[PDB]
Design an enzyme around this catalytic site. Sequence first.
Site, PDB file in Angstrom:
ATOM      1  N   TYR A 116      -3.481  14.607  -2.199  1.00  0.00           N
ATOM      2  CA  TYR A 116      -4.041  13.860  -1.055  1.00  0.00           C
ATOM      3  C   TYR A 116      -5.181  14.520  -0.289  1.00  0.00           C
ATOM      4  O   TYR A 116      -5.079  14.735   0.918  1.00  0.00           O
ATOM      5  CB  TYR A 116      -2.923  13.448  -0.076  1.00  0.00           C
ATOM      6  CG  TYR A 116      -3.124  12.167   0.698  1.00  0.00           C
ATOM      7  CD1 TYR A 116      -3.144  12.227   2.087  1.00  0.00           C
ATOM      8  CD2 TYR A 116      -3.217  10.940   0.061  1.00  0.00           C
ATOM      9  CE1 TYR A 116      -3.263  11.066   2.871  1.00  0.00           C
ATOM     10  CE2 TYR A 116      -3.329   9.760   0.821  1.00  0.00           C
ATOM     11  CZ  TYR A 116      -3.364   9.851   2.216  1.00  0.00           C
ATOM     12  OH  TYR A 116      -3.456   8.738   2.951  1.00  0.00           O
ATOM     13  N   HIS A 171       0.867  -1.212   0.000  1.00  0.00           N
ATOM     14  CA  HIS A 171       0.000   0.000   0.000  1.00  0.00           C
ATOM     15  C   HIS A 171       0.908   1.270   0.000  1.00  0.00           C
ATOM     16  O   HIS A 171       0.724   2.282  -0.754  1.00  0.00           O
ATOM     17  CB  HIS A 171      -0.955  -0.074   1.245  1.00  0.00           C
ATOM     18  CG  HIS A 171      -1.790   1.150   1.478  1.00  0.00           C
ATOM     19  ND1 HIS A 171      -3.199   1.164   1.364  1.00  0.00           N
ATOM     20  CD2 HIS A 171      -1.392   2.391   1.836  1.00  0.00           C
ATOM     21  CE1 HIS A 171      -3.614   2.411   1.576  1.00  0.00           C
ATOM     22  NE2 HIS A 171      -2.560   3.171   1.885  1.00  0.00           N
ATOM     23  N   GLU A 172       1.947   1.204   0.914  1.00  0.00           N
ATOM     24  CA  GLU A 172       2.934   2.289   1.082  1.00  0.00           C
ATOM     25  C   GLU A 172       3.775   2.607  -0.195  1.00  0.00           C
ATOM     26  O   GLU A 172       3.863   3.758  -0.683  1.00  0.00           O
ATOM     27  CB  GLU A 172       3.801   2.078   2.368  1.00  0.00           C
ATOM     28  CG  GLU A 172       3.031   2.024   3.764  1.00  0.00           C
ATOM     29  CD  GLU A 172       1.922   3.081   3.946  1.00  0.00           C
ATOM     30  OE1 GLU A 172       1.786   4.172   3.333  1.00  0.00           O
ATOM     31  OE2 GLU A 172       1.041   2.650   4.762  1.00  0.00           O
ATOM     32  N   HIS A 199      -9.433   8.211   3.520  1.00  0.00           N
ATOM     33  CA  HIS A 199      -9.471   6.830   3.959  1.00  0.00           C
ATOM     34  C   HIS A 199     -10.921   6.339   4.094  1.00  0.00           C
ATOM     35  O   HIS A 199     -11.162   5.144   4.383  1.00  0.00           O
ATOM     36  CB  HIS A 199      -8.746   6.488   5.292  1.00  0.00           C
ATOM     37  CG  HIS A 199      -7.295   6.758   5.225  1.00  0.00           C
ATOM     38  ND1 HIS A 199      -6.825   8.005   5.542  1.00  0.00           N
ATOM     39  CD2 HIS A 199      -6.266   5.987   4.832  1.00  0.00           C
ATOM     40  CE1 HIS A 199      -5.504   7.978   5.399  1.00  0.00           C
ATOM     41  NE2 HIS A 199      -5.148   6.794   4.960  1.00  0.00           N
ATOM     42  N   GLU A 230      -5.775   6.664  -2.137  1.00  0.00           N
ATOM     43  CA  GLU A 230      -5.899   5.588  -1.124  1.00  0.00           C
ATOM     44  C   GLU A 230      -6.387   4.242  -1.737  1.00  0.00           C
ATOM     45  O   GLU A 230      -5.823   3.234  -1.477  1.00  0.00           O
ATOM     46  CB  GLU A 230      -6.884   6.141  -0.026  1.00  0.00           C
ATOM     47  CG  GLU A 230      -6.210   6.871   1.134  1.00  0.00           C
ATOM     48  CD  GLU A 230      -5.059   6.044   1.625  1.00  0.00           C
ATOM     49  OE1 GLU A 230      -3.950   6.474   1.550  1.00  0.00           O
ATOM     50  OE2 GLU A 230      -5.325   4.861   2.135  1.00  0.00           O
ATOM     51  N   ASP A 278      -9.929  13.737   8.051  1.00  0.00           N
ATOM     52  CA  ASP A 278      -9.192  12.775   7.259  1.00  0.00           C
ATOM     53  C   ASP A 278      -8.948  13.300   5.862  1.00  0.00           C
ATOM     54  O   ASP A 278      -9.132  12.622   4.863  1.00  0.00           O
ATOM     55  CB  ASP A 278      -9.968  11.471   7.213  1.00  0.00           C
ATOM     56  CG  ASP A 278      -9.203  10.397   6.494  1.00  0.00           C
ATOM     57  OD1 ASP A 278      -8.007  10.264   6.544  1.00  0.00           O
ATOM     58  OD2 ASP A 278      -9.957   9.588   5.848  1.00  0.00           O
ATOM     59  N   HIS A 318       2.020   4.151  -2.878  1.00  0.00           N
ATOM     60  CA  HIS A 318       1.873   5.634  -2.834  1.00  0.00           C
ATOM     61  C   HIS A 318       3.036   6.308  -3.611  1.00  0.00           C
ATOM     62  O   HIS A 318       2.923   7.446  -4.178  1.00  0.00           O
ATOM     63  CB  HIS A 318       1.983   6.125  -1.378  1.00  0.00           C
ATOM     64  CG  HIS A 318       0.664   6.082  -0.661  1.00  0.00           C
ATOM     65  ND1 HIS A 318      -0.509   6.672  -1.243  1.00  0.00           N
ATOM     66  CD2 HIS A 318       0.316   5.506   0.519  1.00  0.00           C
ATOM     67  CE1 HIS A 318      -1.503   6.502  -0.420  1.00  0.00           C
ATOM     68  NE2 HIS A 318      -1.052   5.778   0.624  1.00  0.00           N
TER      69      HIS A 318
HETATM   70  C1  LIG Z   1      -2.480   0.386   5.358  1.00  0.00           C
HETATM   71  C2  LIG Z   1      -2.605   1.008   6.761  1.00  0.00           C
HETATM   72  C3  LIG Z   1      -2.072   0.144   7.884  1.00  0.00           C
HETATM   73  C4  LIG Z   1      -1.688   2.202   6.892  1.00  0.00           C
HETATM   74  C5  LIG Z   1      -2.163   3.428   6.103  1.00  0.00           C
HETATM   75  N1  LIG Z   1      -1.220   4.552   6.181  1.00  0.00           N
HETATM   76  P1  LIG Z   1      -1.248   5.733   4.695  1.00  0.00           P
HETATM   77  O1  LIG Z   1      -0.302   5.083   3.601  1.00  0.00           O
HETATM   78  O2  LIG Z   1      -2.704   5.991   4.150  1.00  0.00           O
HETATM   79  C6  LIG Z   1      -0.595   7.092   5.370  1.00  0.00           C
HETATM   80  C7  LIG Z   1      -1.545   7.689   6.353  1.00  0.00           C
HETATM   81  C8  LIG Z   1      -0.845   8.905   6.925  1.00  0.00           C
HETATM   82  C9  LIG Z   1      -1.101  10.168   6.452  1.00  0.00           C
HETATM   83  C10 LIG Z   1      -0.408  11.250   7.014  1.00  0.00           C
HETATM   84  C11 LIG Z   1       0.561  11.020   8.033  1.00  0.00           C
HETATM   85  C12 LIG Z   1       0.836   9.732   8.475  1.00  0.00           C
HETATM   86  C13 LIG Z   1       0.124   8.667   7.908  1.00  0.00           C
HETATM   87  N2  LIG Z   1      -0.523   8.099   4.274  1.00  0.00           N
HETATM   88  C14 LIG Z   1       0.499   8.116   3.405  1.00  0.00           C
HETATM   89  O3  LIG Z   1       1.533   7.366   3.444  1.00  0.00           O
HETATM   90  O4  LIG Z   1       0.200   9.049   2.435  1.00  0.00           O
HETATM   91  C15 LIG Z   1       0.815   8.985   1.137  1.00  0.00           C
HETATM   92  C16 LIG Z   1       0.963  10.427   0.803  1.00  0.00           C
HETATM   93  C17 LIG Z   1       1.983  10.738  -0.010  1.00  0.00           C
HETATM   94  C18 LIG Z   1       2.158  12.108  -0.293  1.00  0.00           C
HETATM   95  C19 LIG Z   1       1.517  13.205   0.124  1.00  0.00           C
HETATM   96  C20 LIG Z   1       0.503  12.866   0.913  1.00  0.00           C
HETATM   97  C21 LIG Z   1       0.229  11.521   1.272  1.00  0.00           C
HETATM   98  C22 LIG Z   1      -3.587   3.728   6.598  1.00  0.00           C
HETATM   99  O5  LIG Z   1      -4.579   3.246   6.039  1.00  0.00           O
HETATM  100  N3  LIG Z   1      -3.671   4.463   7.689  1.00  0.00           N
HETATM  101  C23 LIG Z   1      -4.927   4.830   8.377  1.00  0.00           C
HETATM  102  C24 LIG Z   1      -4.992   4.073   9.691  1.00  0.00           C
HETATM  103  C25 LIG Z   1      -4.991   6.358   8.622  1.00  0.00           C
HETATM  104  O6  LIG Z   1      -3.965   7.061   8.520  1.00  0.00           O
HETATM  105  O7  LIG Z   1      -6.057   7.041   8.838  1.00  0.00           O
HETATM  106 ZN   LIG Z   2      -2.431   5.240   2.128  1.00  0.00          ZN
END
Ligand SMILES: CC(C)C[C@H](NP(=O)(O)[C@H](Cc1ccccc1)NC(=O)OCc1ccccc1)C(=O)N[C@@H](C)C(=O)O
Ligand SMILES: [Zn+2]
EC number: 3.4.24.27
Length: 316
Positions: free
Chosen positions: A157, A142-143, A231, A166, A226, A146
Amino acid sequence: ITGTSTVGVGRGVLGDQKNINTTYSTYYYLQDNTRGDGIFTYDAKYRTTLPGSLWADADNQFFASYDAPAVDAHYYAGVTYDYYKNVHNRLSYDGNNAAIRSSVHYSQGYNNAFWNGSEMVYGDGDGQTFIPLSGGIDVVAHELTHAVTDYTAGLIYQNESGAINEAISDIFGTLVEFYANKNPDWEIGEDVYTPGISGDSLRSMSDPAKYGDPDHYSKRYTGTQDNGGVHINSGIINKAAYLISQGGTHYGVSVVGIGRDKLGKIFYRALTQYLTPTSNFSQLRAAAVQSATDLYGSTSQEVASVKQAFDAVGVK
Ligand SMILES: CC(C)C[C@H](NP(=O)(O)[C@H](Cc1ccccc1)NC(=O)OCc1ccccc1)C(=O)N[C@@H](C)C(=O)O
Ligand SMILES: [Zn+2]
Ligand SMILES: [Ca+2]
Ligand SMILES: [Ca+2]
Ligand SMILES: [Ca+2]
Ligand SMILES: [Ca+2]
């Protein structure tokens, strides 16, 4: 690190034994020279400063509990690179073999993982809501996905484009889980979420409603939290993707499934050729229809299933 390529062995977060690609130069490092310009795993030491120290080990054996998250982040990042290469002929996330970097043991009891525009970062979780995040292959993929999005469509985002961002990550993390054949499913995060509750997951693609996420456009979140529900509303696209692949009747609309491989081919083409930073749901619909047309012909059953799937979730 400059040194000799070798192979070490360790145990992952789930207690599974695996071989990992390391580099030897006095210590054994978590540096895999076999994929692109390398895959590198770092120790963030419970701090927030990044990336931390390139992971060094004395004997090429990673069986300590502290080692677990580094082993899985390092190994799953290898699988994801392979999926992209083998299946879509893409070399690493930028398509030019960019080095892939990941940091584990980030902060204390951090319940998340992210792509920071430069590397992947994984918390250890607080032990109840999550165990160390890199123990889930759908999570790792998933990471990394991105990063893929970052270099291609560049979906902003927030709001609609952000929920698409997402969904793409959930869709490809799931395709990667099926590709490694690691107990696959249409659930997200099941392997690392709520170690004490069985059967749940963070999000569901097959039934987003199960956890309260929308499964129809009419149930879209319009608020501000969010990032405008990135999400949350991703559940409408996830459900659409799950119907294209598997088929089903949703809100009275019937979809013939065309399978996973074609789903991956159509989405990848949409992502890399038709989507832009500000693309919305309706634009994703046109992009997916045009990709399936490109690939299978306007009169294909593939094209037919993509239109039904979006009609089922109320997108167009
Ligand atoms: C697959 C799951 C375990 C992990 C996943 N992390 P995620 O991959 O969605 C993580 C969420 C995040 C946002 C901001 C700061 C920190 C974390 N976001 C993230 O990595 O965003 C990618 C991005 C790249 C560039 C600019 C903006 C964003 C998720 O669904 N997170 C949920 C729990 C949430 O953040 O609400
Ligand atoms: Zn994500
Ligand atoms: Ca060791
Ligand atoms: Ca699974
Ligand atoms: Ca899963
Ligand atoms: Ca659980």
